[PDB]
Amino acid sequence: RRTDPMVTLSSILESIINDMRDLPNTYPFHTPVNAKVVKDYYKIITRPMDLQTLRENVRKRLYPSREEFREHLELIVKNSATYNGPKHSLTQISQSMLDLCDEKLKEKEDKLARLEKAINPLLDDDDQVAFSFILDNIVTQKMMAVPDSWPFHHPVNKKFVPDYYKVIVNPMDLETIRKNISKHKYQSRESFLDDVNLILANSVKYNGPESQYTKTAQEIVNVCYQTLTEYDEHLTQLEKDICTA
Structure with missing residues (x-):
């Protein structure tokens, strides 16, 4: 009868993940770091994040608004800045994900605001x-x-x-x-x-x-x-x- 706002938010968030994942050269951020290929990653990075984990978090209903989502996304960028450096190629790629996310959020600002109010x-x-x-x-x-x-x-x-x-x-x-x-x-x-x-x-x-x-x-x-x-x-x-x- 009525639309479920978390069902809706989660879909919008997941489709933003889909678009970020489609951006060129983003595969290192698709899944959690495998430490056998990225040396000492977990000794260096205290709060790892990646797009698959981010999607699982959406599906666990962890994000009631765009802000908690964006926080975790930006952590992908922070973590690349810390591990590889702020101007490393990988950091710019991660930043490109965050920039596309910001565009997508701006385009749906008003819909998101209704959803976030219904959820909270x-x-x-x-x-x-x-x-x-x-x-x-x-x-x-x-x-x-x-x-x-x-x-x-x-x-x-x-x-x-x-x-x-x-x-x-x-x-x-x-x-x-x-x-x-x-x-x-x-x-x-x-x-x-x-x-x-x-x-x-x-x-x-x-x-x-x-x-x-x-x-x-x-x-x-x-x-x-x-x-x-x-x-x-x-x-x-x-x-x-x-x-x-």
């Missing part, structure tokens, strides 16, 4: 998109990782807790918060935190303060605050920019 929404110009992405990660990577948290991952099931919704008027759970995040309900940490805190408050109301349910929700809330603290600078900036628009 922190790069998105839309501040609400970035903010929501952060909140989503806090929920999936931190809150949902809390041990013993499974019953908080979905709404309480009245088949298993028949009384629950007779006591609790405003139920809340982590899946519902994620649905809220995906709809961009939250423009600031405060409205996000009102929903997260509601999870704990409901467990206090329904179970009491000494319940396991309450200790688990307390930990969920705690990692949520701990995590938002870690990201304070970026979230503050994003909050400020969402309020401007």
Whole structure:
């Protein structure tokens, strides 16, 4: 239905590898150095790189943007400068790969920028998109990782807790918060935190303060605050920019 941006980026990157590989006299950079033919190469070069390894790295999803890709490519050039010298014929050949890469990247600049933003929404110009992405990660990577948290991952099931919704008027759970995040309900940490805190408050109301349910929700809330603290600078900036628009 929708295009997969890493599937797309990787194809664009691999086709740039294909074009560099087709450039004249580039074969020494096609595969990793064989030390039996390139004397003491690995004693001299600490971080070897070559186009086959670069392609394998693309296929491992190692490059979410053009910059990490270009870094490794440029390392091919650096390594030739160190081993053979900056004006050696091989260094100019490697430089010719990097120059063709730079041309190809410039030609597709705009497409690459959309892909990189889709792959990493922190790069998105839309501040609400970035903010929501952060909140989503806090929920999936931190809150949902809390041990013993499974019953908080979905709404309480009245088949298993028949009384629950007779006591609790405003139920809340982590899946519902994620649905809220995906709809961009939250423009600031405060409205996000009102929903997260509601999870704990409901467990206090329904179970009491000494319940396991309450200790688990307390930990969920705690990692949520701990995590938002870690990201304070970026979230503050994003909050400020969402309020401007």
